[PDB]
Design a protein around this ligand. Structure first.
Ligand code: HAS
Ligand code: HEM
Ligand code: CUA
Ligand SMILES: [Cu+]
Lengths: 166, 557, 33
């Protein structure tokens, strides 16, 4: 009680800062354990890979939606996704199971998200930059793509599919 | 001149009040869309109704925008230029300069007024983040531009009132309330360049028609400079209130002067160098710095934690004083009859779930679970529709007497909590819904009612949001009746008003003085704060400023 | 008197919800590996 009490506070306070600063690095730590293993590819590419949104749906691997799953390793497969005012090119995207999809996405108009549902794949796609992520669908089927970024009044309606062939 | 010598003794209650009125008006209008946007996430389309009541709305997303500018930019901004000048001003019995103090209020009415227009006219439906290339009528960017700059005049008012005191109590420390707001207005100035270099160089010429394009990677990087601190620009006022004021209206005392100082000290260091948590999912922004800002972001959660201790401690001490007793005996000893004391205490319950939220979100990769899902609208409603807002709503009962005159009859005391308890319960119910669908991948920012077959596993949280819509509409409406009614029925009777607003006081120690003395190196810590920004945004900002890649505008509503 | 029993009961909880949240999530991260 009252100035006496006050002391006891100033060491509890100390415990709090001690215990609390601790569990935070455990976190900083646990994070880093994700940060060094497979599940880390869902983290956008470092580099700017610049483009010219107003041309990209007309020239570039993003022009032809038919030839946008290009094999690239014995097991690598680049996909050229394009994400525009109000769907995904292409619908759908077929990739194989057990194998490494390296998504490369971009916008021809405004910003979009690309939250491939059931996965960590969750990346803002910006006109004129190329968002780039790794994932491996180890178990196949339908995965809906939602746009989680406002982009106008098609927004609540922007989905598409990943089919990953059994 | 006056049958109220009210605004010749002190007209810091003449300016301030106009701040809070504007404020508590913005919060009413914008909050207006709330439960409409609530039932949407509840899977019921309410807009056929709303479009007909207010026939001026055309999108769900236009409301979304009103709700966003008018609750989060205008309402919080106003409520801090209120408190954050008025309080220190009083804790020192000094009058803030009034060319400036009345000028800043013109800036805000001028501003909001200009912006408000495009927005009603649906000529600017790009949301309170207003992410280019979504392009908004030149008139909106000018809105935030001045309105937000009105925080540059007020920084002065405080820092004026800093200079003059220590020119006359020279060699005496800084009184707490003042000491708080000083750093707070300094910190806010570090953050206030983000959106300001963004408005000026990019937004304004673009929207003015003086360039066809903007680079939206940099467009959103300047935003997120400003746009994080800005949540702590909304918080610290209610923190201020809870630190210095709360323990009194709640029967007790601040358990430590310097803990409370420290808490703010680390908020001017770490408020600003932390934008990437919002940019986790950007491309072009090196994985390394996402890590940095993430560590840093966990650092900035360390103030609010000890706050958690210093506050709970106070209320605890206060609880025992009123012959509270049981392990929890201290809680019902509190003045649960007082809205002044209830709103921010419910604020702080609220604050807990909403707290951890930030931290999940805060850890880099765990953002890919929740990012842009409704999870987000969960966390911030918990933090700002709830704590900052309740702390504000609740301020009605000690601030608004102090300010107009007008006491609060048992009737007001009754409505009082009818409002508050409904608000809270609403914010809590809407909380679980929003947070849950959030994990079932219902995107945020979406008119999901127009695709009411698409989130079928949302079935149930969904209900939670429906319900919270009904609840919180019930509570907005009491709030209107309890706002216009504590203002307008005529008890502008003489006496009371005049005051030191209930400051609390402190426990003291030996250790205090040495510490309190070091936290007063305001110029000094303003420096590490400004070392920290430049150290962290600098090496990334340089880069992109060399690969400025402008792309055309878009209207798309 | 002696004890801030209360204030901890408060932070204990504040902690246990940071834990439930963070640990709960983490696993969703992974369940979606
Ligand atoms: C005014 C408001 C806000 C505050 C305050 C706030 C606090 C934090 N947030 Fe946040 N937030 C994030 C991380 C944090 C962290 C680490 C904290 C920390 O400062 C919080 C630390 C808090 C605690 C550790 C809790 C302390 C608890 C206390 C102090 C209560 C004690 C209770 C007592 C004492 C009661 C005692 C009395 C009795 C009667 C018992 C992140 C990630 O890093 C995102 C990105 C999400 C994404 O993907 O976009 C984010 C997204 C947002 C957005 C979305 C922006 C948009 O629209 O795009 C808003 C508006 C927002 C607001 C606010 N946020 N936040
Ligand atoms: C009346 C009670 C309220 C309800 C029912 C409510 C409901 C909602 C909902 C469901 C969302 C998500 C919209 C979406 O993701 O599409 C939202 C967004 C938002 N609310 Fe509220 N809210 C309320 C009060 C407040 C208050 C008091 C504030 C002020 C601090 C506030 C600030 C915001 C902000 C800043 C957003 C984000 C805007 C954006 O997504 O661009 N809300 N609200
Ligand atoms: Cu693309 Cu919403
Ligand atoms: Cu933030």
């Amino acid at each position: 009680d009252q100035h006496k009490a006050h002391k006891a506070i100033l060491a509890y306070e100390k415990g709090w800062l001690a215990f609390s600063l601790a569990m935070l690095f455990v976190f900083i730590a646990l994070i880093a354990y994700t940060l060094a293993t497979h599940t880390a590819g869902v983290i956008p590419a470092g580099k700017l890979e610049r483009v010219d949104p107003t041309t990209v749906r007309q020239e570039g691997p993003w022009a032809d939606p038919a030839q946008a799953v290009v094999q690239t390793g014995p097991n690598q497969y680049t996909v050229y996704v394009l994400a525009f005012a109000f769907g995904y090119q292409p619908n759908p995207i077929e990739v194989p199971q057990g194998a490494e999809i390296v998504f490369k996405i971009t916008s021809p108009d405004v910003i979009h998200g690309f939250h491939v549902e059931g996965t960590n794949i969750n990346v803002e796609v910006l006109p004129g930059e190329v968002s780039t992520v790794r994932y491996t669908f180890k178990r196949p089927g339908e995965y809906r793509i939602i746009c989680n970024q406002y982009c106008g009044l098609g927004h609540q309606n922007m989905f598409g599919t990943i089919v990953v062939k059994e | 001149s006056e049958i109220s010598r009210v605004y010749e003794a002190y007209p810091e209650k003449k300016a301030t009040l106009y701040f809070l009125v504007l404020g508590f008006l913005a919060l009413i209008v914008g909050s207006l869309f709330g439960p409409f946007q609530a039932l949407n996430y509840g899977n019921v389309d309410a807009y056929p109704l709303l479009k007909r009541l207010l026939p001026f709305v055309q999108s769900y997303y236009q409301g979304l925008t009103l709700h966003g500018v008018l609750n989060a930019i205008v309402f919080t901004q106003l409520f801090a230029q209120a408190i954050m000048v008025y309080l220190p001003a009083r804790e020192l019995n000094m009058r803030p300069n009034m060319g400036l103090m009345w000028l800043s209020w013109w800036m805000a009415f001028i501003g909001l007024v200009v912006a408000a227009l495009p927005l009603l006219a649906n000529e600017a439906t790009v949301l309170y983040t207003f992410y280019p290339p979504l392009k908004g009528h030149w008139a909106f960017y000018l809105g935030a531009s001045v309105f937000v700059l009105s925080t540059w005049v007020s920084i002065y008012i405080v820092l004026d009132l800093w200079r003059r005191w220590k020119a006359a109590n020279p060699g005496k420390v800084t009184p707490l309330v003042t000491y708080m707001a000083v750093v707070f207005w300094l910190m806010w100035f570090l953050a206030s360049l983000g959106l300001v270099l963004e408005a000026v160089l990019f937004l304004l010429p673009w929207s003015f028609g003086l360039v066809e394009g903007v680079d939206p990677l940099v467009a959103r990087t300047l935003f997120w400079w400003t746009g994080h601190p800005i949540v702590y620009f909304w918080l610290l006022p209610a923190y201020a209130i809870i630190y210095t004021i709360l323990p009194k209206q709640a029967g007790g005392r601040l358990v430590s002067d310097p803990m409370a100082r420290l808490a703010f000290l680390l908020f001017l260091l770490l408020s600003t160098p932390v934008g990437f948590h919002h940019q986790f999912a950007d491309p072009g922004i090196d994985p390394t710095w996402k890590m940095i800002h993430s560590v840093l972001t966990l650092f900035v959660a360390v103030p609010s934690l000890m706050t958690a201790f210093t506050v709970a401690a106070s209320l605890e001490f206060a609880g025992r004083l009123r012959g509270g007793r049981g392990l929890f005996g201290w809680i019902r000893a509190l003045p649960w009859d007082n809205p002044a004391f209830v709103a921010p205490v419910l604020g702080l319950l609220g604050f807990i779930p909403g707290g951890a939220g930030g931290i999940v979100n805060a850890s880099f990769t765990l953002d890919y679970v929740v990012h842009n899902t409704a999870w987000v609208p969960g966390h911030f409603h918990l933090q700002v529709a709830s704590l900052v807002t309740l702390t504000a709503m609740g301020s009605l009962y000690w601030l608004l007497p102090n300010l107009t005159g007008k006491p609060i009859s048992d009737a007001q005391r009754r409505l009082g909590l009818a409002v508050v308890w409904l608000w809270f319960l609403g914010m809590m119910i809407m909380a679980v819904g929003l947070h849950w669908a959030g994990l079932l991948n219902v995107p945020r920012r979406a008119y999901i009612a127009q695709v009411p077959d698409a989130y079928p596993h949302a079935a149930v949280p969904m209900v939670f949001n429906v319900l919270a819509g009904i609840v919180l509409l019930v509570a907005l409406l009491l709030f209107i009746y309890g706002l216009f009614s504590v203002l307008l029925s005529r008890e502008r009777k003489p006496e009371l008003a005049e005051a030191p607003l209930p400051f609390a006081e402190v426990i003291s120690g030996p250790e205090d003085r040495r510490l309190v003395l070091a936290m007063d190196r305001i110029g000094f810590w303003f420096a590490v704060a400004a070392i920290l920004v430049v150290l962290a945004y600098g090496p990334t900002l340089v880069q992109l400023f060399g690969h400025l890649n402008p792309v055309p505008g878009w209207r798309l509503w | 008197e002696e004890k801030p029993k209360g204030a901890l009961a408060v932070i204990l909880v504040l902690t246990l919800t940071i834990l439930v949240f963070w640990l709960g999530v983490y696993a969703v991260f992974f369940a979606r590996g």
